[PDB]
């Protein structure tokens, strides 16, 4: 987050837009408290049988 | 990028095959490696499978994640053994490496055999992987003293593995291997009878052609138990809006009238 905040001072507009796009997701993760590694599955849930009869 | 079959075939092609000298060399190395494993097992007095696990960990290296502490401890617990009785360990390491080269080089037998087993309910890649499983079993059990080529001993294991995988994974409802073979015999007999007689045969004719212990009633039951479930989303009508499962009522839960 500090690195992208520093990047937000670039004169380039495209660089600023890309850094802002990265910061959106980074700040969403920081605010929600979710860990990024949870986007990788280790155990896959199995739906109850009555909904796949 | 896509089409994993092309990726797998290219990766397989990147590994060269062996010549007769290479094949006999590798097989001999494998044999002396297993013999050395057994000798080291006798020397140390431990269970063979555990020392085998230690050797496998050492060949695979730290790259392959059994924990590091145990395997390291026993590795140095074998370095304590005096010289002359140590060559065996190097021979076992070499033999394990030789198994790796032999398997990688002979993987192509799996594709060559399996390319004529498509269309039996299993995709090509599952057939190939099961064939590699049979290939590992054939490699481990191969005896080069008979001077026979590897292909002769490998083909039988490959066919057995592929056929067992077909019997176990082709159907949603698992049916034992013997009954699957019985259904196979029934189907081939029925198609042969149809071809010779020129029309769809009756159950009695098939039962008579099977032999003793077979009547029409058992044949009906066998055809009955060979049925596979249908999809709940089978499109009904011209428009893509009506499914089969939308016409299935619940007969288990009590109705509102019954509850009242």
């Amino acid at each position: 987050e500090k690195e992208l905040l520093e990047e937000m001072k670039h004169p380039s507009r495209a660089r600023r837009a890309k850094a802002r796009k990265r910061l959106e997701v980074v700040r969403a993760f920081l605010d929600s408290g979710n860990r990024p590694e949870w986007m990788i599955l280790e155990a896959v849930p199995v739906l109850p049988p009555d909904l796949r009869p | 990028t896509s089409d994993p079959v092309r990726q797998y075939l290219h990766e397989i092609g990147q590994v060269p095959l062996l010549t007769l000298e290479e094949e006999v060399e590798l097989a001999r190395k494998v044999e002396e490696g297993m013999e050395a494993i057994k000798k080291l097992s006798e020397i140390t007095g431990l269970d063979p499978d555990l020392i085998r696990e230690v050797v496998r960990a050492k060949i695979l290296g730290s790259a392959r994640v059994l924990d590091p502490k145990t395997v390291e401890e026993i590795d140095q617990k074998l370095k304590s053994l005096p010289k002359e009785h140590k060559r065996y360990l190097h021979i076992a390491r070499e033999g394990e490496a030789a198994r790796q080269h032999l398997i990688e080089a002979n993987l192509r037998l799996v594709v060559s055999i399996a390319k004529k087993y498509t269309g039996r309910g299993l995709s090509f890649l599952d057939l190939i992987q099961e064939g590699n499983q049979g290939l590992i079993r054939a490699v481990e059990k191969f005896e080069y003293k008979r001077r026979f080529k590897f292909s002769t001993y490998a083909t039988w294991w490959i066919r057995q593995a592929i056929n067992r995988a077909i019997a176990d994974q082709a159907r949603t409802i698992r049916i034992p291997v013997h009954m699957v073979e019985t259904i196979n015999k029934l189907s081939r007999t029925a198609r042969q009878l149809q071809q010779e007689l020129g029309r769809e045969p009756t159950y009695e004719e098939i039962a008579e052609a099977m032999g003793p212990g077979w009547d029409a009633k058992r044949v009906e039951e066998t055809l009955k138990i060979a049925q596979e479930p249908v999809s709940l989303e089978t499109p009904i009508g011209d428009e893509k809006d009506s499914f089969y499962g939308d016409f299935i009522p619940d007969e288990h839960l009590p109705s509102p009238v019954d509850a009242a």
Binding site: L41, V46, L47, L51 | -
Partner: protein
């Protein structure tokens, strides 16, 4: 019996939706005004 119908409850289709959304490794949780969990399954799905 001649009385008036009672107050409604959560429809079963929403329970199906919650079950199918959890099966995609997404945690859908119903909360009350005080941000505490509310169990809509009547303790039939909690270990």
């Amino acid at each position: 019996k001649g009385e008036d119908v009672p107050e409604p409850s959560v429809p079963e289709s929403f329970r199906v939706l919650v079950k199918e959304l959890q099966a995609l490794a997404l945690d859908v949780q119903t909360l009350d005004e005080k941000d505490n969990p509310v169990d809509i399954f009547e303790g039939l799905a909690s270990k």
